[PDB]
Design a protein around this ligand. Structure first.
Ligand code: ATP
Length: 536
RNA sequence: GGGGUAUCGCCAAGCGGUAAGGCACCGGAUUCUGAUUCCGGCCCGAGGUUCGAAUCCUCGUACCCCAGCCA
């Protein structure tokens, strides 16, 4: 699987510019990982292992205020669950606070940084606009000695938040807004989840990232398009300090998925306002969310592989994702039987009850063996599989016609019974005793009512009603009210041996898995990962 | 103003020499899952250089990103 980045790497390896590849995944611990991060993970860890190099996991913990320890734990969990391993110990940008501080001092001594006292509002007014250039701060020309003294003052906590900041001295007229004296350090009297209260000054992203990459020996730092302008500051910092290597940044387009949101702020909001059970709600585009929904690490790696790596903005269709999980489960998931919308079907022609039929664990893979499924007179079938009268297109069960039960005989509808609402409460039928192993075209699933197992089924759907929910003025007001719908049904007996993690394919229905969060020893709960491809 | 992008369902190969593949959708074969499997259907605009242009050049047009003491 190739892309413009792997081609850049091949070239460097050929020209001799590098003899090894070292990448990194640098997530900020301010939320859980989503399918978007997965693309970055596959790209970075995938390149490393393919080129026999290294890939680091570095928490970019530069803003204590919006970060929490809870997130570092789940992020590590998901990277591992995805099947990737990082080189060495988990790293943290905060592991470099002392070096970063020393580098700030180097820039100050070269006259390439200074302490600015412009207020947070003033800095915006002096910055200029997209069409107009900015103007130099009145403090831009302080002497080295004065900046040194003032920066130590900031570190010591002598300045209140927003009363001072260390800025790089570049060019207020640069067409690159990011190069208009970017803030390097800002004051925050906030406790840090790694360094506690040792620091009241914290380095900004642009100053931190490139130096962190450099120190770790990163050869190619891969990020998304929104940082293309930043690459100039990334290079400016490395070009102006004393450091032996200069990692190069290459940007690719972020993944966007139809009918869902990918921004951490929006996903957080959904969780905070309780519109979803939690970061791992089965309807969330998060890694943990997809996991609980029934997606396999393998399907996700396949997905990331299929969508490619380019510099083109894109929004992949949900159909693309679902395809990957179907392909995965259609080859490894054992087949079973279950009815989501139950309706009794009495075979009056059946003598009492008691029988056991052999059902394959996979209609295309005998190697998976076969189970022992029971068959009786009173069974359960899905209401959708029966109709009093229907076109020739309806291949299911109809009064006059006869159907075939999955891996069983061939029954024939006879009479029906309804309640005081017209709802069929029971379907009476009869069968052909000799059909174990006319032209009855049609097959439906079923669950012997005697050996039946009460089971709760959770059917999920798109979280939002529109393709691009993030583009709506209020993405919340566009949430799909039917994203989750609980159903009570019955499944064959061999489904009580289901363990959270195992994926079954309820024939004619789709792929499901046990939901440990709701599944009780009494009543099991199955999440529908995805429906089966359905089209007459 | 600067940075990027465009192979017309959604992605995406291509790097001067007969325009891949995946998803989606549409046909047909197999089928005791309306599944699966297997066949088949499917170069932003205008010029210019060139024997030859999706690939190079010029000028456009459309879209995305940048005016946090966020990342
Ligand atoms: N949607 C995405 N597709 C591919 N990579 C992504 C995506 N979102 C974030 N990344 C990248 O993954 C790495 C870690 O991202 P980070 O932890 O900073 O979250 P983030 O940038 O806040 O994500 P978001 O902006 O989507 O909330 C960075 O390189 C980031 O650019």
């Amino acid at each position: 699987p190739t892309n413009f980045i792997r081609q850049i790497i091949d070239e460097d390896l050929a020209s001799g510019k590098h003899t090894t590849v070292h990448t990194r995944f640098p997530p900020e611990p301010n939320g859980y990982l989503h399918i978007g991060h997965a693309k970055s993970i596959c790209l970075n860890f995938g390149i490393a292992q393919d080129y026999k190099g290294q890939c680091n996991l570095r928490f970019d913990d530069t803003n204590p205020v919006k970060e929490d320890i809870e997130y570092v734990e789940s992020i590590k969990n998901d990277v591992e669950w995805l099947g990737f391993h990082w080189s060495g110990n988990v790293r943290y940008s905060s592991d470099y606070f002392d070096q970063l501080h020393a580098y700030a001092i180097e820039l100050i001594n070269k006259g390439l940084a200074y302490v600015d006292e412009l207020t947070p509002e003033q800095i915006r007014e002096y910055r200029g606009t997209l069409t107009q250039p900015g103007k130099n701060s009145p403090y831009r020309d302080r002497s080295v000695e004065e900046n040194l003294a003032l920066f130590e003052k900031m570190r010591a906590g002598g300045f209140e938040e927003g009363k001072a900041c260390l800025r790089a001295k570049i060019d207020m007229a640069s067409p690159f807004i990011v190069m208009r004296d970017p803030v390097l350090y800002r004051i925050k009297f906030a406790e840090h989840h790694q360094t506690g209260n040792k620091w009241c000054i914290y380095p900004m992203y642009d100053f931190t990232h490139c130096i962190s990459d450099a120190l770790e020996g990163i050869t190619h730092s891969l990020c998304t398009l929104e940082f293309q302008d930043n690459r100039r500051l990334y290079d400016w910092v490395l070009d102006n300090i004393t450091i032996p290597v200069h990692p190069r940044q290459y940007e690719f387009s972020r993944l966007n998925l139809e009918y869902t949101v990918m921004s951490k702020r929006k996903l957080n909001l959904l969780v905070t306002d309780k519109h979803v059970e939690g970061w791992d709600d089965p309807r969330m585009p998060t890694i943990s969310g997809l996991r609980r929904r029934g997606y396999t690490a393998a399907s996700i790696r396949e997905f990331c592989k299929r969508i490619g790596v380019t510099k083109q903005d894109n929004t992949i269709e949900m159909a693309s994702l679902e395809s990957c999980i179907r392909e995965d489960l259609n080859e490894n998931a054992p087949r079973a039987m279950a009815v989501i919308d139950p309706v009794k079907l009495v075979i009056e022609n059946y003598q009492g009850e008691g029988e056991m039929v052999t059902m394959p664990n996979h209609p295309n893979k005998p190697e998976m063996g076969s189970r022992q499924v029971p068959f009786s007179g009173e069974i359960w079938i899905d209401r959708a599989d029966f109709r009093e009268e229907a076109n020739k297109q309806y291949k299911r069960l109809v009064l006059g016609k006869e159907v075939r039960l999955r891996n069983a005989y061939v029954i024939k509808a006879e009479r029906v019974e309804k309640d005081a609402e017209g709802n069929i409460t029971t379907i009476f039928c009869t069968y052909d005793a000799d059909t174990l192993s006319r032209k009855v075209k049609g097959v439906i699933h079923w669950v012997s009512a005697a050996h039946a197992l009460p089971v709760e089924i959770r059917l999920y759907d798109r979280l939002f009603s529109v393709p691009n929910p993030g583009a709506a003025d209020d993405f919340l007001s566009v949430i799909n009210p039917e994203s989750l719908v609980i159903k009570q049904g019955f499944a064959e007996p061999s489904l009580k041996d289901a363990v959270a993690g195992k994926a079954f394919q309820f024939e004619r229905e789709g792929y499901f898995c046990l939901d440990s969060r709701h599944s009780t020893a009494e009543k099991p709960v199955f999440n529908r990962t995805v429906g089966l491809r359905d089209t007459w």
